[PDB]
C-alpha cells in the first residue's frame, strides 16, 4: 500500500526534523543566556542525549517486540518524544520558564533531554522495520525501494530542520525556533494515529526472546533458527562498528574543515543583522543525498538489478565503505592543501558568532570529498538498514534494528574517543584545538588519512565477514 508507506515516510520526516532541530543548536542554547551553562557542560549534555538515543534503541526494539507491538510502541514513543520536546519551548520562553525553573535550569532540561532521547531511540528502532513491513509482502526489492525512500525522507527532514529550524533558532528566536520541532513531533504523532487505520501491524511475540534467552530438543526449529540467525548477524554488526566510528568522525571533522574554508557569505539572509548557522555546514551531506537517492532508485538500482551486480546488501555496504574511505582520502588531500594555504593567507569569517580563521580556499572544494561520502550513504547506510531488516529474525526485527543503531552509537562513541586520543600531546594531531579553537595548527590531514586507513582495514575485515556470512 502507498498510504501506509507514505504515512511512515512523513512521520519519519517529522521525527528527523524535530531531532535535528534539537541537536543542531542545543549546545549554543544552553551556553547562551539565561541558561549560562559552562563551556563543556552543554557539550556533555548533548553527548549524554545522543548516547541515550543510541543506548535505548535495543530496549526500544525489545519493548515493541515483546510487550507493546511495533505499531503501539511508536505511538507511545512519539508521545514521550512530544512530552520531552515541550520542555524546550517552555524553557526558552521567559513567560513559561518560571513553571519549569548542570546549571540553574538543569532538572527540566535534563528531563526533556532524557525523554527526547528515549523517544528518538524507540522511534528509530521501531519505525524503520515497521515501515519495511508495509511492503515486505511485495518482496525484497520493494523493501529495498522503501529503504531508499526512507533514507530520502530522513535526509529531507534533516534538510528542513538544519535549514529552517536552525536558522530560526539562531537568527530569529529560540521560542519559535524550538516550537516548530514540537509541532513536528505532534504532526508525526497525528500522522501515525491517522495512518493506524491503514498500517499493517504484526502482533507482538513476548516469548520470542525467552527462547533466545534460554540458549528434537526442547525448542522448535524456528525458535532455534532465530538464535542461529542472531549469532550470525552479531558479527556483521560488530564489523560495522569501525565504519560507524569513521563515518561519525567524518560528520564532525568535515564540518570543522568547512568552518576553516572560505565559506561564501550571503549578503541578503546571512548578512550583518543575522548569522550564518553552523548547521548549514552540516547540511551539505543531506543536500547531496536528497539528489543522490532518487538517482539511485530510478537509475542506478534498476541497472544494477538488470545486470545482476551487487544483489546482496553486504556487498553494497562494502562498496559504501570503500566510497567513504575514498572520501576520507579526498578530505585528507584537501586538508593538506588547506594547511599549506593557511600559512600566508588567513581570512576571518563569522559562523554563528564565532570568528573562524579560514584559508583562501573555496568551501566548494569539499564537493569531491562530500559527493563520495554521499555515495557512501547511498550504499553503506541504506543497505545497512536492509541488512538490519532482512537478516533479522522475523520475531525480533525491531530488537535487531535497535541493536544495529546501538552499535552505530558504540561506533560514534569509539570515534569520539579516537578523536580524543589523537588530541593528546604525545600525538598532537588535533591537540591545538582548545588553546585557540582553530584547526589551522591541527594536523587534520593526518587524522583524515588515519580515518581512511581505519576504513580500509574495516572494509577488508567486512569483506571477509560478508564472505563468511553468505558462505
Amino acid at each position, epitope marked *: 500500500r502507498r498510504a501506509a508507506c507514505g504515512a511512515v515516510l512523513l512521520t519519519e520526516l517529522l521525527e528527523r526534523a524535530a531531532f535535528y532541530g534539537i541537536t543542531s543548536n542545543l549546545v549554543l542554547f544552553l551556553n*547562551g*543566556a539565561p541558561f549560562c551553562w559552562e563551556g563543556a557542560q552543554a557539550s556533555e549534555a548533548l553527548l549524554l542525549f545522543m548516547g541515550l538515543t543510541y543506548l535505548g534503541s535495543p530496549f526500544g526494539g525489545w519493548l515493541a517486540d515483546a510487550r507493546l507491538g511495533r505499531a503501539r510502541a511508536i505511538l507511545l514513543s512519539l508521545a514521550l518524544y512530544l512530552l520531552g520536546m515541550l520542555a524546550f519551548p517552555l524553557l526558552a520562553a521567559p513567560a513559561t520558564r518560571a513553571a519549569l525553573c548542570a546549571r540553574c535550569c538543569s532538572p527540566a532540561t535534563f528531563a526533556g533531554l532524557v525523554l527526547v532521547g528515549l523517544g528518538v531511540a524507540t522511534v528509530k528502532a521501531n519505525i524503520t522495520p515497521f515501515g519495511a513491513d508495509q511492503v515486505k509482502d511485495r518482496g525484497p526489492e520493494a523493501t529495498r525501494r522503501f529503504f531508499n525512500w526512507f533514507y530520502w525522507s530522513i535526509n529531507l527532514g534533516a534538510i528542513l530542520s538544519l535549514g529552517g529550524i536552525a536558522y530560526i533558532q539562531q537568527n530569529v528566536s529560540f521560542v519559535t525556533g524550538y516550537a516548530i520541532p514540537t509541532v513536528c513531533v505532534g504532526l508525526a504523532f497525528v500522522v501515525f494515529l491517522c495512518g493506524q487505520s491503514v498500517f499493517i501491524t504484526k502482533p507482538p511475540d513476548g516469548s520470542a526472546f525467552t527462547d533466545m534467552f534460554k540458549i528434537g530438543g526442547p525448542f522448535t526449529e524456528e525458535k532455534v533458527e532465530d538464535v542461529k540467525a542472531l549469532v550470525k548477524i552479531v558479527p556483521v554488526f560488530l564489523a560495522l562498528i569501525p565504519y560507524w566510528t569513521v563515518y561519525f568522525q567524518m560528520q564532525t571533522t568535515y564540518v570543522l574543515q568547512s568552518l576553516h574554508l572560505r565559506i561564501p557569505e550571503i549578503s541578503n539572509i546571512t548578512t*550583518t*543583522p543575522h*548569522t550564518l548557522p553552523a548547521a548549514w555546514l552540516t547540511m551539505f551531506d543531506a543536500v547531496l543525498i536528497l539528489l543522490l537517492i532518487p538517482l539511485k532508485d530510478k537509475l542506478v538500482d534498476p541497472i544494477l538489478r538488470r545486470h545482476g551486480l551487487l544483489p546482496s546488501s553486504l556487498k553494497r555496504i562494502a562498496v559504501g565503505m570503500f566510497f567513504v574511505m575514498c572520501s576520507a582520502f579526498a578530505a585528507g588531500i584537501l586538508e593538506s592543501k588547506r594547511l599549506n594555504l*593557511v*600559512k*600566508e*593567507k*588567513t*581570512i*576571518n569569517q*563569522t559562523i*554563528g*558568532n*564565532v*570568528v573562524y*580563521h579560514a584559508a*583562501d580556499l573555496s568551501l566548494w572544494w569539499q564537493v569531491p570529498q562530500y559527493l563520495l561520502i554521499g555515495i557512501s550513504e547511498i550504499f553503506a547506510s541504506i543497505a545497512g538498514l536492509e541488512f538490519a531488516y532482512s537478516a533479522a529474525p522475523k520475531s525480533m526485527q525491531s530488537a535487531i534494528m535497535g541493536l544495529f543503531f546501538f552499535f552505530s552509537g558504540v561506533g560514534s562513541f569509539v570515534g569520539s574517543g579516537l578523536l580524543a586520543l589523537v588530541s593528546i600531546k604525545a600525538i598532537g594531531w588535533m591537540s*591545538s584545538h582548545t588553546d*585557540f*579553537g*582553530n584547526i*589551522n*595548527g591541527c594536523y587534520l590531514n593526518y587524522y583524515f588519512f588515519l580515518l581512511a586507513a581505519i576504513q580500509g582495514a574495516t572494509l577488508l575485515l567486512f569483506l571477509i565477514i560478508s564472505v563468511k556470512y553468505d558462505h
Partner: antibody
Amino acid sequence: QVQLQQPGTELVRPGASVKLSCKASGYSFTRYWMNWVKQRPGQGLEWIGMVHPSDSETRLNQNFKDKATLTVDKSSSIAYMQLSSPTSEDSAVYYCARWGAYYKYDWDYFDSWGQGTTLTV
Amino acid sequence: DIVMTQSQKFMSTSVGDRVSVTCKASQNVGTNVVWYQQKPGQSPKVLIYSASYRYSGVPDRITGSGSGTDFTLTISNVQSEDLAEYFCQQYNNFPYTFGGGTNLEIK
C-alpha cells in the same frame, strides 16, 4: 620590533588624489592583514578597509567605497591607501593598523598600529 | 554595520578608584570585542582582546567582561597612566566598528 612607519602630515588640496603610505617592517609583510583606520579630531575611530599583502584582496568598508583604494607594494613592503577627491570632511588621522591573526593564532586584534598620518585638506 | 555604542563619552575618575567603561553592541557580537587604549597623542594600543582576555603588558588591573550585546572594561586600580580614550571594537562582522570612545578624566 614590528614597525608600521607613517609619514605624518599629508597636507593636500581638495579634489586631488592622496596616497597615504605605511612602511611595514620588522615582520613578514605578506601574512597579516593591513587595515586602515580613520580618526576624526572630534569623533571616534572608523575602520576603512583591509588589504592582505599577498593577494591584495581588499575588504573595503562600504561607507568608504569609491573614496578609499587599498593597494600594496610588496617589493618595498609598503601598504598604500588612496583617497580620490578628498573633500573637507576627509581630513583626519589615518592609522595603518596591522591585524594580529594568522596560521594557528586566533589573536584577532589590531596588534601594531602606525603613528597616524594627519591628512589635512 | 554593528553600531557599537559607548553611551558615556567622558568618565571622571580619581587615582586609586575604579571606573567601568561600558559598550553596548547593536547585535549579538559574542566574545568578539577588543578594547584599545589611545593615550593622548598616540596610536591606540590593544588592551583586551576577546572582551575578556588581557594583552601582554597590561598591568592586570584593567579587566574585561561581557558577551553578546553588552561589554565592560573595568579598571579597579586607576593610576595616572590610565588617562586615555578607550575604544570598543567589534570584529564579529564586517565592517569593523569602533565605539564612540571613552576618555578617563583623572581628577
